[PDB]
Chain length 139, copies 3
């Protein structure tokens, strides 16, 4: 899968240009420090919009070779140490979505939990589990 | 992928014939009757349908295929969670489809007929089709 | 998909030669708890499944911007839901280059202890295609 990603700020384009360690998942960044209040879910804004592209496949069903596809949003295994849990389990981002990617993070503790810019709680994966590439693009 | 689906009552068949939110890599299933979900419990909610999934044979390393039951993105606005994260429905299954919902709040939670908490999706993430049908080949 | 499991003990190698609940159709390969444990109420325990493993499939073309190894998935079993145990990271994603022990992060959501027994089955391995799975016991 290849992803085209729009950064919603220069700050965010700079952490994506310098993505160090990059797999069948693409780690997304927490982009702004933030406090997640206890026993409640926060819709964390990852400062990014993104289409996913994939080779057209033939499938059973009662215009191009390379198709706009749906993709998934997984919790990173990391999240386990944390009291944050994905409130929708796995994110499913339909092919036609053009909003910002959000991580719906459920804070299970009775305390505040603090996330920080450059934190890594979440990752994008393809329905194939195939390796992911991305380019930075302005629209 | 193509779903053949048996609706287990005329109310439910109504909902699916006039299904006004399926255009899609997922297929929204409806809550079929009002329920109060006890707090901090898990409840097995019956969805009023049997469903078989069909895909072109691949070579691994038309056939019956395994498929998935995802939470809908919008369940995140509630205290409800799929106990089993993502439902895995084997190819051989012909029973009623059921969602295991955890109510994670200290208070009861009400769900209503025509609520859409859950969706069917193919392992490929491809667009889905479905017909309604009076029964499955089971004999 | 095909799996090559190295069991990390002999007691565990036992479990897998005599695997009862896998047969030839399905899409999930059940994994055994491998030793008794108690999980402290309201907590997330890493539970070690006492195996390591690589998956292989017929390679295809993919967009970028024979037999290959591949990423695969650790799902909860349907049956986990009659428990207060939940998979913390929802679905484990295991990358083509993992060569360590399969571990299962389980939250206990109980305000009590929960004893997990050897030969319990809370968790299963699945392929991205949902296709049936073979396994093979291996030492390397
Ligand atoms: O894990 C996911 C899953 C879906 N989405 C996208 C795609 C979906 F159309 C849209 C759903 O938007 C949210 C929503 C909408 C209505 C009711 C509840 C929640 C959403 C975001 C994240 C997870 C689940 C749902 C949303 C979007 C923006 C702000 C708040 C909530 O956001 C994500 O970005 N992350
Ligand atoms: O998310 C899912 C996952 C699987 N299924 C199907 C296929 C599976 F065999 C069967 C699982 O049956 C339940 C079960 C099985 C074993 C141990 C405990 C519970 C089940 C259903 C739904 C979700 C999770 C578990 C079951 C069986 C009878 C009554 C209630 C629940 O139903 C669902 O409909 N939804
Ligand atoms: O469900 C899963 C998901 C991934 N993995 C693999 C791949 C990953 F690098 C490695 C990570 O193991 C844990 C980890 C990673 C980062 C930060 C903390 C902990 C892990 C395992 C299971 C669930 C969540 C996280 C890990 C590693 C060693 C000891 C304990 C836990 O295990 C599993 O075996 N089970």
């Amino acid at each position: 899968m290849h992803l085209k990603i729009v950064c919603l700020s220069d700050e965010v384009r700079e952490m994506y240009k310098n993505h160090k360690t990059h797999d069948s998942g693409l780690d997304l960044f927490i982009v702004k420090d933030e406090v997640l209040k206890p026993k409640s879910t926060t819709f964390v804004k990852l400062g990014i919009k993104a289409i996913a592209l994939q080779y057209k496949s033939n499938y059973y069903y009662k215009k191009s070779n390379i198709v706009n596809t749906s993709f998934l949003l997984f919790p990173r295994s990391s999240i386990s140490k944390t009291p944050l849990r994905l409130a929708n389990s796995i994110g499913l981002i339909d092919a036609g979505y053009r909003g910002e990617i959000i991580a719906a993070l459920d804070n299970t503790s009775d305390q505040e939990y603090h996330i920080k810019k450059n934190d890594k709680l979440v990752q994008l994966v393809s329905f194939t589990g195939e390796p992911l590439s991305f380019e930075l693009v302005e629209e």
